A paper describes a structure:
Certain nucleotide reverse transcriptase (RT) inhibitors (NRTIs) such as tenofovir and lamivudine can inhibit both HBV Pol and Human immunodeficiency virus 1 (HIV-1) RT, leading to speculation on structural and mechanistic analogies between the deoxynucleotide triphosphate (dNTP)-binding sites of these enzymes. The Q151M mutation in HIV-1 RT, located at the dNTP-binding site, confers resistance to various NRTIs, while maintaining sensitivity to tenofovir and lamivudine. The residue corresponding to Gln151 is strictly conserved as a methionine in HBV Pol. Therefore, the structure of the dNTP-binding pocket of the HIV-1 RT Q151M mutant may reflect that of HBV Pol.
Here, the crystal structure of HIV-1 RT Q151M, determined at 2.6 Å resolution, in a new crystal form with space group P321 is presented. HIV-1 RT Q151M was crystallized in the trigonal space group P321, with one p66/p51 heterodimer in the asymmetric unit. Although the structure of HIV-1 RT Q151M superimposes well onto that of HIV-1 RT in a closed conformation, a slight movement of the β-strands (β2–β3) that partially create the dNTP-binding pocket was observed. This movement might be caused by the introduction of the bulky thioether group of Met151. Gln151 in motif B interacts directly with the 3′-OH of the incoming dNTP and the conserved Arg72 via hydrogen bonds. The structural analysis in this study also showed clear electron density for the Met151 residue, which indicated that the side chain of Met151 is flipped out from the dNTP-binding pocket and is exposed to the solvent. The structure also highlighted the possibility that the hydrogen-bonding network among amino acids and NRTIs is rearranged by the Q151M mutation, leading to a difference in the affinity of NRTIs for HIV-1 RT and HBV Pol. The structural comparison also suggests that hydrophobic interactions between the methyl group of TNV and the thioether group of methionine might compensate for the loss of hydrogen bonds; hence, tenofovir exhibits an inhibitory action towards both HIV-1 RT Q151M and HBV Pol.
Author numbering:
A (entry chain A): 1 to 553
B (entry chain B): 2 to 88, 94 to 217, 231 to 428
The structure:
């Protein structure tokens, strides 16, 4: 049926006209298949025949269903979508099963026949024109247009979700206690109500949807646990991610790949390590949805590892507002962080991994800070509140960090959990010069034309040094010069530099770095007992800074 | 009500409307905004819209000082930036008043309708917990709060309601910025509060306010560049002084470090005490007299933007400078610590930004563009939790561990 809901006004992009893409030729089998399909959705009012005055056209294909003899009417709206106005994505994300409160009565309704039930703006309908071609190229083709939201058109998801929401609106007011989640095909309805009283409310909703042109098949109607909902299996006490099976095809088409990527993108939110880069690279340079795409070596290996990842079972419990939210973080290798969000011990709501691979120089303290923020933000999205944190860092460690850190930083309510590897400041620069310690006056320079340079030091104990450097820069030689001072010295040192760059990155006190140079400097600082780093304005007649600058330049 | 003519409002040439995403909100704030928006919808102030509106502007909830009622705040910074310019001289006398009270007259804007062709640009979204429902979308039908077009369009109506009070009190300065009203006088504090009460009652009578915060510009002190005072100067202490004087020479003239650099001869140890020569004591002394007062000849350009840099000095102290061109400060200052934020840097930073912006409003009638010494993710996560103003200034994030830290304290 077709909903009596008010259409949503749609326009093309400013200065753009409708699509005029020529229809490709088709087999007599495919053509006659499309004629049978179009005939059915013509008498159901989903499409209408149009006159020869309509200049617009969008290509259509005829593909068979997966393991079925039935034909599908596929339309390539890529040209119309480019010319269609932008819509605002209202949702801030996907509903998480752990965001659901436990309900005594649960029903998941199938509203799959929903796209072809929402009317399209009458002014826009002409731009969705398509042609069923003729084999003889002499008989004119049958031309239709959509009266309803087309599958694959840019505005279909947004306008549908908007339509559904407005239709569900009065039912939710009449039933503020009943929880309703909508997401395309699946319609979740939960209540702490007796079955008979609940099932009656279900029929009330279905009749409400039916009057608004939305049918709910009793075949896909789910009555008893477990309930399938958005790729999740809902049990009364727990929820389980249903096994995600990836297709196995000899010949992949463009349509197949993008559907795979879309599916893998959804799974990447639940599973860690899901990659789609090598599959997306296959798509670049394609012209048709039916175009066959050969999997490269990197692509088929990427798909293979994705399969192994999706084999891991994922499950969790439901949310209980009466208990507090607890979030615990622990440090792992390669700057990776894992976390669990629970309320009762060993009853996780959400489990995930955070891989921090953005930046050159950092420490475990800053990485933990950013992890807390990411978790706090997620919790607000799902539960509307921030959790109490359990962090593997001493209260003294953190206090020594934020009080000396030039930059403003802060962490919410948190208690310490003693479980290695703990987050620790591996070193700390002195606030005052070290007495009795050798004073290294450090400088370095480099030729911008030849990438050649020198680096060295002069000390108050008469010790001097200068080392030739190749393939370096003005910034690299300044770090190498400090690195030299750390190398040829005791466990306590004063280092004077004129480099604002070199000074800056050591003030942040990093414990890990992409640079082999910085990493070695970090290793040196850890082995040292006391290190004071001082800055001096270059070229102003400062003693030690003078002798070392002339020796390097 | 009879339809009154809306003034035609357009965007700047070549500019499209605001397309900014809504950030997550807590359950408490969502419920508060829902209740507020339902009321505004019933009163015709806002209308529900669909996805065919490609524009969006962030919304959130704050609580003003000396109040417990939830206040709806919309971040129109992107829209304001793209909105046409509307063409009030800033009252210079406002800065020289003993007491300036801040009144919120934001509700007055909801009396004037907004141009129908412009309403689409005021779209905003109330998010839902766990995305149970797609966010509730609204747009404005009347003049929105936080939009720079509102005080401009409503200016004529604002001058009429203040005309009786401004004649009865010719020595009382009233300035308007966005939703806030600044009322300043040299009157005694006891008699002052009775005058602002007389004004707010006059505003309550005509629906400018719907059923405290005092400022004292004379107490706003300048933070000068100070030089250390020691009897024993190490080589390190000399180097620090040279570095501070070298930087300060970019702002002030006649600053020299020749006599001080002579003390740094040979290859000295950092902890070595070096006796100051009589000419080094002289050079230092005359440098102090230069840094005693602010630099002359630094004029405020009404066309150019104001810039504010902030430094964290620790112990709850924060320094800040306001300029339009580098090393030409219009104002410098330092804020002492305050109880309640003893362990919260972000809370201290947010309060500092509001104070600086407030002072900038009183002095120049404009908020400065802030360079915040904080990570973007850290600030954007909790800054709303401590915001109490109805306006929001521009800001960016800087990450340079400075020597400029002790170059101001």
């Amino acid at each position: 049926p077709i909903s009596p809901i008010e259409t949503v006004p749609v326009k093309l992009k400013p200065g753009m006209d409708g699509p005029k893409v020529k229809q490709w030729p088709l087999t007599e089998e495919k053509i006659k298949a499309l004629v049978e399909i179009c005939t059915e959705m013509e008498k159901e009012g989903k499409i209408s025949k149009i006159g020869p005055e309509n200049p617009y056209n969008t290509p259509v294909f005829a593909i068979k269903k997966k393991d079925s003899t039935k034909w599908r009417k596929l339309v390539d709206f890529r040209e119309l979508n480019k010319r269609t106005q932008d819509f605002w994505e209202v949702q801030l994300g996907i509903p998480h099963p752990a965001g659901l409160k436990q309900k005594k009565s649960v029903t998941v309704l199938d509203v799959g026949d929903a796209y072809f039930s929402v009317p399209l703006d009458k002014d826009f309908r002409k731009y969705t024109a398509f042609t069923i071609p003729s084999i003889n190229n002499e008989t004119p083709g049958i031309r239709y247009q959509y009266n309803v939201l087309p599958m694959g058109w840019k505005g279909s998801p947004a306008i549908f979700q908007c339509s559904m929401t407005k239709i569900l609106e009065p039912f939710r007011k009449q039933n503020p206690d009943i929880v309703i989640y909508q997401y395309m095909d699946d319609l979740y309805v939960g209540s702490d109500l007796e079955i008979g009283q609940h099932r009656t409310k279900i029929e009330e909703l279905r009749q409400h949807l039916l009057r608004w042109g939305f049918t709910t098949p009793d075949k896909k109607h789910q009555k008893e646990p477990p309930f399938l909902w958005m790729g999740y299996e809902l049990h009364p006490d727990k929820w389980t991610v249903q096994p995600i099976v990836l297709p196995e095809k000899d010949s992949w088409t463009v349509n197949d790949i993008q559907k795979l990527v879309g599916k893998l993108n959804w799974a990447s939110q639940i599973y860690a390590g899901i990659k789609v880069r090598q599959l997306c690279k296959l798509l670049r340079g394609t012209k048709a949805l039916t175009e066959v795409v050969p999997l490269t070596e990197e692509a088929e290996l990427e798909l293979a590892e994705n399969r192994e990842i999706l084999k891991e079972p994922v499950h969790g419990v439901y949310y209980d507002p009466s208990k507090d939210l607890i979030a615990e973080i622990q440090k792992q290798g390669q700057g990776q962080w894992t976390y669990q969000i629970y309320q009762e011990p060993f009853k996780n709501l959400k489990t995930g991994k955070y891989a921090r691979m953005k930046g050159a120089h950092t420490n475990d303290v800053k990485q933990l800070t950013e992890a807390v923020q990411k978790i706090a933000t997620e919790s607000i999205v799902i539960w509307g509140k921030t959790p109490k944190f359990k962090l593997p860092i001493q209260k003294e460690t953190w206090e020594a960090w934020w009080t000396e850190y030039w930059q403003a930083t802060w962490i919410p309510e948190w208690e310490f959990v003693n479980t290695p590897p703990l987050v620790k400041l591996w070193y700390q620069l002195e606030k005052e010069p070290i007495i009795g310690a050798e004073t290294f006056y450090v400088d370095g320079a480099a030729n911008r034309e030849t990438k050649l340079g020198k680096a060295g030091y002069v000390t108050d104990r008469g010790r001097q040094k200068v080392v030739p450097l190749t393939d370096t820069t003005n910034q690299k030689t300044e770090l190498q010069a400090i690195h030299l001072a750390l190398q040829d010295s005791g466990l306590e040192v004063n280092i004077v530099t004129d480099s604002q760059y070199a000074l800056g990155i050591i003030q942040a006190q990093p414990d890990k770095s992409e640079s082999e140079l910085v990493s070695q400097i970090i290793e040196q600082l850890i082995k040292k007992e006391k290190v004071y780093l001082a800055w001096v304005p270059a070229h102003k007649g400062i003693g030690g800074n003078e002798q070392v600058d002339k020796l390097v330049s | 009500i009879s339809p009154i003519e809306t003034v035609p409002v357009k965007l700047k040439p070549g500019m499209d409307g605001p397309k900014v995403k809504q950030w997550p909100l807590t359950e408490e704030k969502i419920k508060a905004l829902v209740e507020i928006c339902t009321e505004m919808e019933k009163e015709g102030k806002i209308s529900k819209i669909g996805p065919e509106n490609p524009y969006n502007t962030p919304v959130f909830a704050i609580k003003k000082k000396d109040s417990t009622k939830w206040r709806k705040l919309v971040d129109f910074r992107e829209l304001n930036k793209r909105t046409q310019d509307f063409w009030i001289p800033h009252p210079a006398g406002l800065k020289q008043k003993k007491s300036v009270t801040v009144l919120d007259v934001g509700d007055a804007y909801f009396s004037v309708p907004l141009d129908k062709d412009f309403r689409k640009y005021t779209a905003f979204t109330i998010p839902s917990i766990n995305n149970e429902t797609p966010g509730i979308r609204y747009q404005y039908n009347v003049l929105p709060q936080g939009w720079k077009g509102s005080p401009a369009i409503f200016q004529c109506s604002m001058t009429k309601i203040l005309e009786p009070f401004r004649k009865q009190n010719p020595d009382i300065v009233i300035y308007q910025y966005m939703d806030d009203l600044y009322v300043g006088s040299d009157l005694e504090i006891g008699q002052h509060r009775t005058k602002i009460e007389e004004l707010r009652q006059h505003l309550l009578r005509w629906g400018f306010i719907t059923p405290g915060y005092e400022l004292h510009p004379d107490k706003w002190t300048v933070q000068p560049i100070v030089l250390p005072e020691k009897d024993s100067w190490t080589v390190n202490d000399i180097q620090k002084l040279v570095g501070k004087l070298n930087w300060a020479s970019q702002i002030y003239a006649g600053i020299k470090v020749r006599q001080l650099c002579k003390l740094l001869r040979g290859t000295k140890a950092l902890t070595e005490v070096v006796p100051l020569t009589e000419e080094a004591e002289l050079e230092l002394a005359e440098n102090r007299e230069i840094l005693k007062e602010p630099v002359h000849g630094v004029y405020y350009d009404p066309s150019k933007d104001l810039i504010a840099e902030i430094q964290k000095q620790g112990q709850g102290q924060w320094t800040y400078q306001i300029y339009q061109e580098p090393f030409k400060n219009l104002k410098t200052g330092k804020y002492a610590r305050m109880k309640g934020a003893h362990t919260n840097d972000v809370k201290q930073l947010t309060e500092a930004v509001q104070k600086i912006a407030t002072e900038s409003i009183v002095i120049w009638g404009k908020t400065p563009k802030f360079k915040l010494p904080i990570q973007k993710e850290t600030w954007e996560a909790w800054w709303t939790e401590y915001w109490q103003a109805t306006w929001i200034p521009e800001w960016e994030f800087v990450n340079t561990p400075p020597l400029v830290k002790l170059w101001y304290q």
